[PDB]
Structure formats: C-alpha cells, structure tokens
C-alpha cells in the first residue's frame, strides 16, 4: 500500500556479477542496518568467476558497496595418506546470504571437493560450502558439512547410501532466533536432498583454517530414505523456520521439495530432529510447488502461517487451454494441535510466463494496521514482461485477495527484478518497514521505503 515507488534507492555491483541474486538486512552490534548482497559470478583473483559478497551501508543515494572479503584460494591438505582438495572456481559464493545477530552467512553451493588416495578418488563433486563473517571484528569461519573422505569404490559397494557428495550445502539457508544455522542441500543423498544444522557459535569455535575436514559435534543432519517418492525431490531447495507445534521451546523447520513424488512437489514441516509433522502436497506436476516458502502470521492471531510459491503453475483457461502464470498458496495455522488444512487462499498470476510466486517476502506490518503483510514477486510479470512485485495485506481472515500496490521493475528487460526479496526491516528508522528487491540480471538492488499511509 504505502511503499514509495517515486524515490527509490539503487545499489549496483560489477557487470556480469549477478549482484542482487541474494540479499538480506544486516544489523551491526549497535543496531545500524545495512544490506548484505550476494553476487555469485563476481570475478576472483585468477580472473575466474567465484562469486563475492558486498556489505552496503544505508544511504538514500545508494551507489557502490565495499566488499565483504572471503578466502577465494583453492586449498590442498596432505594428511592421513590422503589428499584433500577444495575447488572454488564457479562455486557461486553469494548464491545465498543471510544475517543473524552481527554475523553474516554467505554460501557457495557449487564449491567442489575431492579426496585423492593413490590411484583412487572420492570424485570431484559439488558438496557446497558456507562462509561466516563477523564484520566488525574480522572473524571468519567456514561450515561445509557434506565434505567426506570416503573413496568412490565404497559408495558403489554400498549402493550409494548416505551419499553426500552432491549436497550443494547452502543452496538455501536460514538461522533460528537462537542462532542455529540451517542449510538446505537439495543434492544431498544422491539428489533426495538433506538439511544440515549447527549453532553459529559452534561453527566459529570448532573452525581453524587449513584443516578442511573437521567435526562440529553439535551438528545435526537429516536422513537418507528408501522411499522413491523422495528420489530427485530436491528437498531443501528452500527452507524457513517458525512455530507450528504449540510448544514455544521448540523451533520447527519448513522445507521445500519442489520435485517431490515425480515432480508433484511438496513442502514439509518438521521438528528440529527432522521428524515430519505435516506435509503439503503440490497441486500440479512440474509447477515447482515449494520453490519458495514463507512463514509469517498474516491474520493477527499470533500463530505463524505458511505461504508456498509454485511459480510454474498453469492456470486453466477457456477452450481447455492452460497458461503458465504461477500461484501462491496460503495456509493458516489452526488453533492448538491440529493439521494444517486445505489452503485458505489461492493467489494466481496473470502474465504468461511471469513466474508469480518465485519469491515471497514477509513485510511485517507495512501499513501499521495490526496485521502482517507480504510481497510476492513475478520476476517476468507485468504487461512488458520486465517483472513486478505485488503487495498483499493481512486481515482477520488471512490475506486480501487483491494487491494493495504493484511495483513495476525500474530495470530493463531480463533483469529478473524480484527474484530475491527481503522485507520487515526499517532501514531508515522512520517507523515503517521497508523492502529490498534484487535484480541480479541488471546487477542491482532497489530499496523501496515505506511512508505514512496516504
């Protein structure tokens, strides 16, 4: 409703760097809000793409941002009669970023890894890796829970069970309020997908440079499965957290699996031991139900609600025809111990191939009426195909069915305006929460400031 589309703020990264692919608000130890921006094709030292991260101070004029520096050098360790290797070329550092407290977590899902032993090898595979920074102190740590030292022949002999070689850890990420980092790894267990969790504090305290293979004893990983419904399900393509079991001492995980059960798609709600509490099934095969998930209480009862994006949903139209437009599903959490039911509301895109529901961002209470609101992206929507972001306001019965405001991309064609979104943080301290929109195709980020309601 009351985001200002006249006076925007633009931040820009280097050409071809995909600056804006991911972003988050970051608060330093004094409460000053900045923007952390991932740029997963930033050039490294060898003039090769490795990705990079930027930490943008808030300025109404925007502009260029300083780098948040991470070690981009490949590593080798000869130990235990083996040779351990990391490979950072095309690793995509900054394909996801998330901030918690005064710590920034930036991940490189396509970082590769191999282990050599005489003539044998583990195979060079994308286990992924995450980089952690405390910018004010300069502290650095890493977390790469899918690295192993098992040789290729052993996986073959054991029928490829518990095979974490293709995890792409950090593909998606989230941090609980208590500081547990949760990583989505959709390639885990031979492309079923897994989740990896560890406290941020234990990641820093257990990390030392050059070790490459180390234990984080408080870490917890999800489980392999023999059920073919999970095969190639990319469980962990997206992740979120929330309160869904009525016990405030436990944090529950929300996991997107957009190709679950032969591309039907699914979203699952788990306890922190990865035991499944609910499963939401996709409505239409190939719609990519679970591509995005969002957790926020939209109807003011204090119970977290769930939004799920299926950006490739094909809507039925006249003459038995189908139109790919995308769809968002809203599930209200019922009072007390009960299953989530049918969706309370279906929001459906309009523009052919617009990918409505590719991203869903909680806004907090934008118009300050007592109900939380959301922004949905259609990165190829709008009448010109340049991309749109649509604001939907909460109300006592869920969400409004029509948007209160539509933001048209300020960038050229192909910018993917809205592919990444983040809201619910007041960056300019005017008492209203604001919205940052990534446009990695244009290597830019736009900031929309919320203003008093007109």
């Amino acid at each position, epitope marked *: 409703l009351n985001l200002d589309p006249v006076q925007l703020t633009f931040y820009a990264g280097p050409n071809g760097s995909q600056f804006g692919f991911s972003l988050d608000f970051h608060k330093d130890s004094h409460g000053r809000v900045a923007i952390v921006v991932g740029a997963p094709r930033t050039l490294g030292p060898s003039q090769e793409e490795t990705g990079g991260v930027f930490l943008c101070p808030w300025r109404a004029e925007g502009g260029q941002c300083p780098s948040l520096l991470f070690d981009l050098r490949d590593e080798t360790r*000869n*130990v*235990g009669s083996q040779t351990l290797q990391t490979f950072k070329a095309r690793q995509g550092l900054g394909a996801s970023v998330v901030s918690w407290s005064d710590v920034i977590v930036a991940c490189a899902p396509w970082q590769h890894w191999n282990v050599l032993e005489k003539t044998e090898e583990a195979e060079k595979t994308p286990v992924g890796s995450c980089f952690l920074a405390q910018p004010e102190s300069g502290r650095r740590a890493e977390y790469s829970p899918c690295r192993g030292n098992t040789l290729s022949r052993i996986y073959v002999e054991n029928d490829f069970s518990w095979d974490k070689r293709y995890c792409e850890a950090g593909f998606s990420s989230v941090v609980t309020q208590a500081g547990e980092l949760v990583l989505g790894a959709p390639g885990g267990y031979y492309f079923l997908g897994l989740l990896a969790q560890a406290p941020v504090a234990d990641i820093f305290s257990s990390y030392r440079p050059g*070790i490459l293979l180390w234990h984080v004893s408080s870490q917890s990983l999800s489980f392999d499965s023999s059920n073919p419904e999970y095969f190639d399900g990319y469980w962990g393509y997206s992740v979120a957290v929330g309160e869904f079991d009525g016990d405030l001492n436990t944090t529950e995980y929300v996991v997107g699996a957009p190709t679950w059960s032969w591309t039907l798609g699914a979203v699952e709600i788990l306890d922190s031991y990865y035991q499944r509490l609910h499963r939401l099934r996709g409505e239409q095969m190939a719609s990519y139900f679970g591509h995005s998930v969002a957790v926020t209480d939209v109807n003011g009862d204090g119970r977290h609600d769930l939004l799920v994006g299926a950006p490739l949903y094909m809507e039925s139209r006249a003459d038995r025809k189908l139109a790919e437009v995308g769809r968002v599903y809203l599930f209200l959490q019922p009072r007390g111990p009960h299953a989530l039911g049918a969706p309370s509301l279906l929001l459906t895109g309009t523009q052919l191939y617009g990918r409505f529901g590719s991203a869903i961002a909680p806004l907090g209470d934008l118009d300050r009426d007592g109900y939380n609101d959301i922004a949905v992206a259609a990165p190829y929507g709008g009448p010109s195909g340049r991309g749109q972001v649509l604001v939907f306001l909460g109300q006592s019965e869920g969400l409004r069915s029509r948007p209160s405001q539509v933001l048209d991309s300020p960038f050229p064609t192909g910018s993917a305006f809205g592919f990444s979104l983040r809201g619910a943080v007041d960056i300019d301290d005017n008492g209203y929460p604001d919205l940052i929109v990534g446009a990695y195709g244009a290597n830019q980020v736009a900031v929309y400031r919320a203003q008093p309601v007109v």
Partner: antibody
Amino acid sequence: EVQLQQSGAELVKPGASVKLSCTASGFNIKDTYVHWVKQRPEQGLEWIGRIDPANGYTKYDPKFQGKATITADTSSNTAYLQLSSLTSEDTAVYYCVRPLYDYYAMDYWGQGTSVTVSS
Amino acid sequence: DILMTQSPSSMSVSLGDTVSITCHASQGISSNIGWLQQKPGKSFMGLIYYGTNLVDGVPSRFSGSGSGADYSLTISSLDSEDFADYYCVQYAQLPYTFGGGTKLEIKR
C-alpha cells in the same frame, strides 16, 4: 563432556585371547574415528589401528595385522580391541583415542586398560 | 614409516622457566603433528593439534610451532603440573607414529 571409559585390567595366559572395550561417554561413538594405541616403557607408544564406527571400516599398522582386530557396536556406543595368540610382548597398556575437531587428530584419550600375559 | 625423533629425552628445569621440546620427522609432514601430555601414573591429554592449534581447555602458556619436518612445543613459565611426559605424533601418513617422549624433571 567427552569421556572414553575403558574396561578393567586383564590378566591372561599366553596363547589365549582378550577383548578390550572403549565406551563413549557424553557423545555418539559414531561421530569420529576411534584409534587404538599400545604403550610400553621401553618401546614407547605404538599406533595399532583405527575404526570408523559409522561403517566398520578399519586400518592397521602391518605390525599388528593378525593380532589386533578392532570392532564397534553403535548400539552399546562402544568400540573394541581384540587381541589373539597373546605373548609376553603383548603385555602393555592399551588406549582408545579420538580427535577433537581435526578428522585425523589424536586429542581425547581413554584412561587405559592394563594387560598382563603370564603363565 | 615416518620416524619421529623427539629431543631431548629429558630436561632438568625449574618453575617459571621457558622450555622448548623439539620433534624432527624423517620427511615433511606439513604441520600434521599433535602434542600430548601424560602426567605421572595417569592417562594422556591432548595439547596441540595441526602444529599450532590448542586443544580446548589447554592453558595458553603452551604453544606449538614449526614447519616441514621440524616442530617445537614451548611452555612459557612452567607450572608445578607441567612436570610430566610429553610426546609428539604425526598423522600425515598411516601408520601414525610417535616420538620417543620427553620427561620434564625438577632441577635441584
């Protein structure tokens, strides 16, 4: 806290066999490698071998191939060292070891199990 | 196998001294070395891993250094509890191998 609690002192005859145990206290034995080390006053410290209790795969120093057999049972959260065809030179103190952070290190040690071979 | 030559076999020193134990390997081990402590009539405690990293709980008066095939364990300001046996161990290659040990004794 991480503690490795080993079995009590053994007193056996030559030619027999003995099985020592190392029970994990405060953690899952499956988490890391578990090593076995032999100590004698003159000969000092000698690495016997290791096991990965998650799968059972083992490595040995070729000096102990035949006498040493390392096993593990994640159910009891315990690792084992079986010694066979015992001799006066197998009289030693045997320790189980695990790393702290580095996958390959030797940081946490059990209290040691004394073995004495005699007729 | 990799031979670990640890010197000296023993040293007679006093409280508050700064002392250094050395460990020479038959080939480079690229800091894949740990340092151990065995107090009289007791089991072992890890001090250092990967050449320079203190095990959790170890006091900071301990420190490790070196590179290639030559490493050192240093104790700044000896405490009464520090008079014990110390061993190095390499884990660059299997089989793991140990140094012969160093005993810190009280001088008089």
